[PDB]
């Protein structure tokens, strides 16, 4: 049907036998069998009706073939990279969530995997990074937290041309804004803690594969490694997913309003927003994004203290995470990207004074009034 | 106090501010902060009051220093082995759960990790397997499904003598029967889907470390990889853990009764039970095990069909998993150990006719009557 | 705060001690006490942090003083009417949900309570029904299922003039559309199974009182009778409430589109919609309702079979309940109002061919296309 | 089967279609229908697979025909008494839980219902209370908190002889100790917050009827009044019920040990325990009770302060409720029976210095050591 209708009714969204208008929460760890092998489900880790349904939904939403729900976005990333073996080289984006940076440096390189960081907006930089042992290209768009917009279909074509895998981290856009499998990508993955759960009460990850033979691989790993999303929280994700469209419009609209508002502040010295029209990413954003996202990062004038600004907001809420109905705000150097050494941070674009604002769903008037409370506290 | 009292009151078992006689279920993904860094909790993946409490409990029960709860026992094993890097060699037990076999062969060896299988009851075999790149010894006791009893304190001393790590998979015994950290081991890990949840409605894993510096390492990995146990199911584990003592006595007692009963059957050609007194493992079992477990594996006479036997039980329940209040039964070649190639299975002790019976909690009379229903369905 | 911001942040919407961006689920039945009496909470039935927060929220949303959450809307109605004693007379609306009819006839009249049904759009009819033993006026607007719009502030003034209580059942409008406490009413009550939970996975009721001395009375009854809303489902209500504004706009807009669409069908012989402009209720609706609701009832031409029409819809879903993201549809004579005798039904406006359509949130195009599938099946 | 096996496998304890070893949690509020009326379930309040299964279990356990799960024990009592109408007279026990006293005085007498309190151990007192408008006999055994043991089969025969209903509140014994439907009673009801949930994290009530025509009546009221037990907490009850036998033995045994221990204290001036052999209730207790319960009430010497005693226990926990794995303790005049006026309390047996101890499951040694801490603080 149309996309709004797929949220309500797509995936598996009911119970065949009873008519229940809500996938039951199958807490059972195991399932009895009449004949061996013939049983439809066998063990809750290998798969169960509750997580099966959330998996179904994220996949129809992403225009892919198979969904896979994981305990966290980190856990999803980890078993996706478990496709690769020692010797393999991966090209990564120069700006990714600090944890993806951490999992690579602190774990994956232990496993014989090598990495090269690349501004994947420069395709020649990407093309130049491809070695005979290179096996994949991993990137986010928009990036955490600078919101660099990368050309998905471009990177996908590069990947196919060289028998590489394309892995896009679609957390910030969500399928309402971007469906990377529709631009040639092989694997799409989400931190469903953000916009797909949307209510600030679920940690989880999602992977959606387009080919069926890579669904086999990601599934075999999901079950062999077991970092699965549990029944209650699979059920909550799917519950929060049903409002994704309604929530995401409210986010996008509010963020338009916050950007025009921050641009009109001289206290604000730089702004990161894919809808900034002097931003060179502006056109690739329009082309591949239905909306410009609801994340804005910005810098204050160098003498101005961002912690003062942030600790004096009162409707906006100082915390990590993003994609929540509540507008969260954060200083990535002191929080989500402290896992990256300060020298690499400043080298890749993340000054110590950067502020990252997950625009939320509250009434726009109350948000601007609140941001004013924070500008007022640093004398502006 | 005493162990039964630690189940009810140990770990964190209440709520400091309210008095609540039950750790609240902290579904929040993130936590607001008044001043950056100084917040007690930050992000539900990194840790939250609900999972923190289950973590506390499994650790006081295991006589260790730190607990870590994971999405599944598999997920716990995976991030424990993420301590190791390419080049490292691990000695493993010749009989481990087929999934541990699978994670090793299908994933871990991709990461440059090498393995040697060893009957860790033969300490000279173990001693002989130790190479200059060997870094750890991983084993279960009792083993899945043959219930080989290994000398924990012996393997621990071997490990310390060679600057190795000892990793014991304590799923079948549980802390009520065995506390391997008390015999010199560094890491203890559980499939909490079995006896610790005990109710057949939770998938989860637990790791407990004894040193504090290895708790730091396992924690850093728990958070960086993210295969964490979610709040609802952390809460259910801890709920099921409170009855572990009551349930485990009932299991052990029933299993004593099932063994004497199966031994008196000529249809039963071989039996695997750590309390079998002609079993050479019998004495190391008495020495290090408070009870003999509630798992029995057995073989029928070669012309007798184990699937007929199993598909004709009606109180006992044909399914995977174990440690449940309900007595589960299973054929490991056709089920939990199908992940091991048939030739390696027969080579390591697992005939195609082996039956594995998780003795449960139902009334012993009803169980023997039921097992009779299955013997009746095969004689000739 | 503006209303959209109160959904996200109003009531109690976080956890004071931790910062948790989600009221924890306090499953504890009881709370320890250091000193007797001086404990803040005491017993989960009497009140707990989880249900306390949902109670807080429905009350700030309704512009009242106290919230009270119940196990179901029926259970809320029952303990509200438990204010009254034998001898008391209540005026009720001629069109109320069949269960309110049932609770009155089958239970409340057993208790010595007397009732008079009255079209509360005719204020003289209401005024004329007031006897010396009359103690309250109970009504819904819009009514289930004919959507008769009653003048709330008019009925409120009548009530105060005669030392009566005004009880309005605000289920169909919800606080986004109507806030009856702002028009002079004493008690507002909800079937939170409808729009406040909004996700078709919560049964519950809410009562909000404006005076503080009637909050005392409703509270004393909530605890003495105990028909309370449990912690998990209190938590889900409040979770579903956060999107009420986003969801309710989508509902209202879709319903505008469905009405214009049904009006342009000659197969449709009569329509019940508070926004029908030839409907005499149209102006009192504009005056007291922010939107016209998202319920439409309609009749087909007398030879046309409504069960054929309904059993041939495929995006719309044949079931009881309403207020769900999914568009539910139903035949009140054969379903929600079978509890009213057929003769009283036809007498009060409910023909056997009436159809009631809870307009939902799915894309409007897919809904009209679907309703066409049902018109096509009866030949029009 | 045997009773221990019915806890694990009785009622509905699995899922027919999947084999799930755990009744799924059917959060759906409503159920789709293919043809009207034909649907097995239709609205979660009227009944759903999750609560249906808990209802099934409490009924097979109680040797009755129909189970009914309610939001709280209070809510169960309230809709059971909703069978009666104005004019009806009920005989009640002189010692019932203070809330049952409150619901009667503060609500039920409003409805034209009249009550007579009677020591139902004296059958002539009961016989003498029966008026032409008397319709039922309501009592608890053991009573809250004095644990008066009443002759169930005697009261049942009295009831049938006079076309009365017998309603026994079986909360303190639980079906493991007493099954009143087996002694001639019509209605059995439980506060499942106590021993049936057993884990101190569920509020709920249960009613079990023996005749099928009274199951119809209690059901019609359950649905019309709606004070139902919600899906998550229905699921938790049934989860806690599976260990009832294991937990209840531990309770009973510990309580034997606590009584002998308290009897040997001269600081303890009076003791209430159905197993006290100088207690005249001792023999009717042996005859109708499998065990003597795990509640002990006792008085200290008149100069000794019970709040000092209680506020100085540290394994035992000062709170309301009972039946929990943790040993709770309480002063009924200052807590659970403050709802009864002090003069009626002292008149019926409840001095201001009475202590009520819900013996729990913790190790007996740790409990006696703890009670010593409280005797030490007042000096024995
Ligand atoms: C694009 C992307 N992909 C993947 C992920 C990971 O997904 P999750 O495992 O959290 O669900 C994220 C996470 N994002 C959160 C993480 C908070 S920091 C974690 C903790 N403080 C720590 O120090 O480790 C954020 O930027 O605010 C992500 O933005
Ligand atoms: C000693 C030990 N350590 C660890 C684990 C893993 O713990 P979990 O991740 O399951 O919680 C187990 C598991 N045991 C279950 C697994 C069922 S098979 C899985 C599935 N059919 C598949 O084909 O993969 C069993 O033997 O019955 C284990 O016995
Ligand atoms: C304005 C109003 N107030 C109160 C309520 C009651 O609230 P709840 O207890 O359901 O949450 C409702 C209910 N409405 C549902 C009830 C379904 S019928 C019940 C069952 N089939 C039965 O035969 O009894 C409906 O019309 O579709 C209500 O519309
Ligand atoms: C034999 C019996 N039947 C029924 C019930 C009622 O069952 P529930 O509704 O609690 O589940 C009970 C309750 N018993 C608890 C109630 C705590 S007091 C309530 C509150 N403090 C208030 O002041 O009101 C107790 O004695 O400790 C009961 O002992």
Nearest ligand 2 atom to alpha carbon B172: 1
C13 lines ligand 3 (CB under 6 A): no
d(CA D205, CA D189): 7
Please give, rounded to a whole number of angstroms, the shortest distance from the CA of D377 to a CA of chain C: 16
- The CA A336 to ligand 1 mean position distance, Å, reads 7
Question: Which residue, judged by its Cα, is nearest atom 10 of ligand 2?
Answer: B73
Identify the experimental approach: X-ray
d(CA C19, CA C30): 23
Residue B66 contacts residue B209 (beta carbons within 8 Å): yes
Nearest ligand to the C-alpha atom of residue B48: 1
- What SS3 string covers chain A? CCHHHHHHHCCCCCCCCCCECCCCECCCCEECCCCCCCCCCCECCCCCHHHHHHHHHHHHHCCCCEEEEECCHHHHHHHHHCCCCCCCEEEEECCCCHHHHHHHHHHHHHHCCEEEEECCCCHHHHHHCCCCCEEEEEEECCCCCCCCCCCHHHHHHHHHHCCCEEEEECCCCCCCCCCHHHHCCCEEEEECCCCCCCCCCCCCEEEEECCHHHHHHHHHHHHHHCCECCHHHHHHHHHHHCCHHHHHHHHHHHHHHHHHHHHCCCCEEEEECCCCCCCCCHHHHHHHCCCCCCEEEEEECCCCCHHHHHCCCCCCEECCCCCCCCCEEECHHHCCCCCCCHHHHHHHCCCCCEEEEECCCCCHHHHHHHHHHHHHCCCC
Which residues neighbour B11 within 8 Å (Cβ) at sequence distance 6 or greater? B53, B54, B55, B56, B57, B58, B59, B60, B61, B67, B238
Residue whose pair of structure tokens reads 């209430």 in the numeric block:
D272
Q: Which of A246, A247, A315 to mutate to test the interface with C (most CBs of C within 10 A)?
A: A246
Size of chain A, expressed as the number of residues it contains: 380
d(CA C238, CA D230): 16
Number of Cβ within a 10 Å radius of residue A369: 14
CA–CA distances in Å: residue A165 to residues A138, A178, D349: 8, 18, 79
d(CA B279, CA B148): 10
d(CA C85, CA C102): 18
Residue whose pair of structure tokens reads 């109690």 in the numeric block:
C12
Alpha helices in C242-335 (DSSP H): 244-263, 282-288, 306-310
Contact check, Cβ <8 Å, C246/A242: no
Residue B127 φ/ψ region, left for φ over 0, alpha for ψ in the -120 to 50 degree band, beta for the rest: alpha
Nearest ligand 4 atom to alpha carbon D74: 9
B222 lines ligand 2 (CB under 6 A): no
A touches which chains (3+ CB pairs under 8 A)? B, C, D
Q: Nearest 5°: phi and psi at C232?
A: -60, -45
User: ∠C95-C101-C107 over CA atoms, to 5°?
Assistant: 160
Task: Please report residues of D whose CB lies closer than 8 A to that of B200.
Answer: 21-22
One-character DSSP codes across D113-149: -EEEEE-TTSHHHHHHT--TTEEEEEEESS-TTT-PP
Contact check, Cβ <8 Å, C30/D78: no
Q: What is the Cβ-side half-sphere exposure of residue C126, based on CA atoms within 13 angstroms?
A: 26
d(CA B249, CA A268): 67
Q: Nearest 5°: phi and psi at C210?
A: -95, -50
Token pair for A304: 């101005």
**How far is residue D226 CA from its own chain's centroid?**
21
d(CA C196, CA C190): 8
- For A49-61, b where at least 16 C-beta lie within 10 A, e where not — what string? bbbbbbbbbbbbb
Which residues neighbour A122 within 8 Å (Cβ) at sequence distance 6 or greater? none
Token pair for B146: 């043959």
Q: DSSP character for C190?
A: E
CA–CA distances in Å: residue B372 to residues B314, B316, B328, C44, D239: 11, 11, 16, 47, 29
Torsion of CA A280, A286, A290, A294, to 10 degrees: 30
Residue C217 contacts residue C147 (beta carbons within 8 Å): no
Token pair for D342: 């002090």
Helix and strand numbers (H, E) in chain D are: 13, 12
- The CA B43 to ligand 2 mean position distance, Å, reads 29
**How far is residue D167 CA from its own chain's centroid?**
12
d(CA C66, CA B366): 55
Q: Given B8, B201, B247, which is nearest D243 (Cβ)?
A: B247
Residue B355 contacts residue B331 (beta carbons within 8 Å): yes
In chain A, the residue whose alpha carbon lies closest to the alpha carbon of D34 is A19
Nearest ligand to the C-alpha atom of residue B339: 2
Edge-first strand listing for the sheet containing A328-330? A268-272, A295-300, A354-358, A328-330, A317-318
Q: What is the Cβ-side half-sphere exposure of residue B352, based on CA atoms within 13 angstroms?
A: 7
Token pair for C328: 């539910």
In chain A, the residue whose alpha carbon lies closest to the alpha carbon of D15 is A31
Question: Which residue, judged by its Cα, is nearest atom 14 of ligand 4?
Answer: D321
Residue B78 contacts residue A225 (beta carbons within 8 Å): yes
Question: Which residue, judged by its Cα, is nearest atom 15 of ligand 4?
Answer: D321
Residue C360 contacts residue C327 (beta carbons within 8 Å): yes
Question: Which residue, judged by its Cα, is nearest atom 15 of ligand 2?
Answer: B321
Q: Nearest 5°: phi and psi at D317?
A: -125, 125
CA torsion sign for D325, D331, D332, D336 is negative
- The CA D316 to ligand 4 mean position distance, Å, reads 19
Please give, rounded to a whole number of angstroms, the shortest distance from the CA of B366 to a CA of chain D: 7
Token pair for A60: 């129809």
A161 class by beta-carbon count within 10 Å (0-12 exposed, 13-18 middle, 19+ buried): exposed
Residue A357 contacts residue A295 (beta carbons within 8 Å): yes
Q: What is the greatest pairwise CA distance in chain C?
A: 74
- The CA C99 to ligand 3 mean position distance, Å, reads 6
d(CA D194, CA D204): 9
Ligand 4, pocket residues at CB < 6 Å: C 42-43, 45-46, 223, 226; D 72-74, 97, 99, 140, 144, 169, 171, 191, 193, 203, 205, 320-322, 336
Task: Please report residues of A whose CB lies closer than 8 A to that of B78.
Answer: 225-227
Task: Please report residues of A whose CB lies closer than 8 A to that of D39.
Answer: 19
Task: Please report residues of C whose CB lies closer than 8 A to that of D232.
Answer: 230, 232-233
Secondary structure E strands in chain D: 66-70, 89-93, 114-118, 134-140, 165-169, 187-191, 205-209, 268-272, 295-300, 317-318, 328-330, 354-358
**How far is residue C186 CA from its own chain's centroid?**
16
Residue B168 contacts residue B180 (beta carbons within 8 Å): yes
**How far is residue A379 CA from its own chain's centroid?**
35
Token pair for B252: 């052990």
Residue C199 contacts residue D199 (beta carbons within 8 Å): no
d(CA C332, CA C344): 13
CA–CA distances in Å: residue D131 to residues B203, B243, D101, D115, D154: 59, 49, 21, 11, 18
Residue C36 contacts residue D338 (beta carbons within 8 Å): no
Q: Given D1, D246, D315, which is nearest B9 (Cβ)?
A: D315
Residue A80 contacts residue A90 (beta carbons within 8 Å): no
Element (DSSP H or E) covering residue C184: none
Strands A205-209 and A66-70: antiparallel
**How far is residue B103 CA from its own chain's centroid?**
16
- The CA C99 to ligand 2 mean position distance, Å, reads 49
d(CA C79, CA D218): 18
Nearest ligand to the C-alpha atom of residue B188: 2
Residue D17 contacts residue A17 (beta carbons within 8 Å): yes
Please give, rounded to a whole number of angstroms, the shortest distance from the CA of C81 to a CA of chain D: 11
B132 class by beta-carbon count within 10 Å (0-12 exposed, 13-18 middle, 19+ buried): exposed
Task: Please report residues of D whose CB lies closer than 8 A to that of A19.
Answer: 31-34, 39, 41
- For B220-255, b where at least 16 C-beta lie within 10 A, e where not — what string? bbbbbbbbbbbbbbbbbbbbbbbbbbbbbbbbbebb
A364 lines ligand 2 (CB under 6 A): no
Q: Nearest 5°: phi and psi at A238?
A: -60, -35
Residue D116 contacts residue D89 (beta carbons within 8 Å): yes
Contact check, Cβ <8 Å, B328/A193: no
C233 lines ligand 3 (CB under 6 A): no
**How far is residue C202 CA from its own chain's centroid?**
14
d(CA B52, CA B228): 11
Please give, rounded to a whole number of angstroms, the shortest distance from the CA of B201 to a CA of chain D: 7
The closest of A249, A216, A241 to A22, measured between CA atoms, is A241
C191 lines ligand 3 (CB under 6 A): yes
Contact check, Cβ <8 Å, A5/C362: yes
Residue A183 contacts residue A288 (beta carbons within 8 Å): yes
Element (DSSP H or E) covering residue C358: strand C354-358
Helix axes C231-241, D231-241, angle to 10 degrees: 160
Q: Domains (ranges, CATH) in chain C?
A: 3-241 (3.40.640.10), 244-376 (3.90.1150.10)
Contact check, Cβ <8 Å, D33/A15: no
Question: Which residue, judged by its Cα, is nearest atom 27 of ligand 4?
Answer: D321
D51 class by beta-carbon count within 10 Å (0-12 exposed, 13-18 middle, 19+ buried): buried
d(CA A168, CA A141): 7
């Amino acid at each position: 049907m149309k996309f709004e209708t797929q949220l309500i009714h797509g995936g598996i969204s009911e119970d065949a036998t009873t008519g229940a208008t809500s996938v039951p929460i199958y807490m059972a760890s195991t399932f009895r069998q009449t004949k061996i092998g013939q049983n439809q489900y066998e063990y809750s880790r290998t798969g169960n009706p509750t997580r099966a349904a959330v998996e179904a939904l994220i996949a129809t939403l992403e225009h892919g073939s198979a969904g896979f729900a994981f305990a966290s976005g980190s856990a999803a990333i980890n078993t996706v990279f478990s496709l690769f073996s020692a010797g393999d080289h991966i090209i990564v984006g120069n700006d990714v969530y600090g944890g993806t940076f951490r999992l690579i440096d602190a774990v994956l390189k232990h496993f014989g995997m090598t990495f090269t960081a690349v501004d994947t907006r420069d395709l020649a930089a990407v093309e130049a990074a491809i070695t005979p042992t290179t096996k994949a290209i991993y990137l986010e768009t928009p990036t955490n937290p600078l919101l660099h917009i990368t050309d998905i279909a471009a990177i996908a074509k590069l990947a196919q041309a060289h028998d590489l895998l394309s892995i896009i981290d679609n957390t910030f856009a969500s399928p309402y804004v971007q469906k990377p499998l529709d631009l040639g990508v092989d694997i799409v993955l989400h931190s469903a803690s953000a916009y797909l759960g949307g209510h600030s009460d679920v940690i989880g990850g999602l992977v959606v594969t387009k080919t069926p033979a890579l669904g086999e691989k990601i599934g075999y790993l999901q079950n062999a490694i077991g970092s699965i999303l549990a029944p209650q929280e699979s059920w909550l994700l799917q519950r929060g997913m049903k409002t994704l469209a309604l929530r995401m419009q409210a986010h996008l609209n509010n963020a338009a309003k916050i950007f025009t508002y921050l641009k009109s502040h001289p206290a604000v010295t730089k702004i990161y927003y894919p809808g900034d029209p002097d931003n060179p990413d502006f056109s690739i954003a329009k082309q591949q994004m239905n909306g410009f996202g609801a994340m804005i990062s910005f810098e204050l004038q160098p003498g101005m203290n961002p912690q003062t600004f942030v600790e004096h907001l009162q409707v906006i809420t100082l915390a990590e995470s993003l994609g929540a109905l509540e507008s969260l705000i954060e200083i990535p150097a002191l929080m989500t990207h402290g896992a990256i050494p300060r020298t690499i941070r400043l080298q890749n674009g993340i000054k110590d004074e950067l502020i990252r604002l997950s625009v939320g769903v509250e009434a726009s008037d109350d948000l601007l009034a609140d941001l004013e409370r924070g500008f007022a506290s640093i004398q502006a």
